[PDB]
Every structure is written in C-alpha cells, then in structure tokens.
C-alpha cells in the first residue's frame, strides 16, 4: 500500500463522525469539522435539501442538519452571561446578593 498525503483533494477518509446524539444539553459537537457548543433543539424552519448548516446575522452556526438524518437541529448555547453582586459596605455587614 502506497499513500499520497496532502497532494490531492480529499477523497478517502476514516470513520470520524462520533457515535450518538444528545438533546436538550449543550455539547461540544463537531458537525463535519465545525466545532461548537450549543443545545440541540428542533427548529420550526424549513430547510432546502441541498443545505447543510445555517448561519445567523453573526455568521455563526445556529442551525444544522445531521450527516445521517435528514432532520434539522438548531444551535442555541446554554446558560451564559455575567453575574453581578450587590453588597453594602464591608465595614457595615458582610451579606451579599447575587443578580444574573
């Protein structure tokens, strides 16, 4: 067996497509080379058959179709955002409040 590495367009590759699926939980998926984190959710929109993945105004993967299943999934990240602390002076007391 003689191989040619990085001398032709990619035609033959191995089984790198993961095993299963997880819904309602943000995971670091890899949709055929597109790695990102988001919660897989069913999308109301209709996808044309030739389309592979969707892009929002931010030019980021927010929708995608499965490489094996014709159904389409949405990429929405799980709970993110900053946290703020409301506290009085340290000379007065020490109780604090947490606001998201």
């Amino acid at each position: 067996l003689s191989f040619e590495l990085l001398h032709a367009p990619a035609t033959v590759c191995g089984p790198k497509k993961s095993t299963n699926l997880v819904k309602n939980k943000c995971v670091n998926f890899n949709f055929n080379g597109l790695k990102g984190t988001g919660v897989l959710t069913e999308s109301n929109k209709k996808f044309l058959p030739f389309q592979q993945f969707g892009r929002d105004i931010a030019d980021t993967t927010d929708a995608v179709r499965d490489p094996q299943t014709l159904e389409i999934l949405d990429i929405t990240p799980c709970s993110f955002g900053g946290v703020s602390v409301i506290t009085p002076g340290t000379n007065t007391s020490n109780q604090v409040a947490v606001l998201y």
Partner: peptide
C-alpha cells in the same frame, strides 16, 4: 401617558448585552 409621547414612541422603532435603564 399622554397621546403625544405615545405617538412619539410609535414613531421610533454573544457577550454583548443591553442593560435596561434604572
């Protein structure tokens, strides 16, 4: 609200967040 500022309100239509005013 008075209708004037109601009409004026009707006329005007990823890390970044918009904090509402106090």
């Amino acid at each position: 609200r008075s209708p004037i500022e109601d009409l004026l309100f009707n006329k005007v239509t990823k890390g970044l967040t918009v904090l509402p005013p106090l």
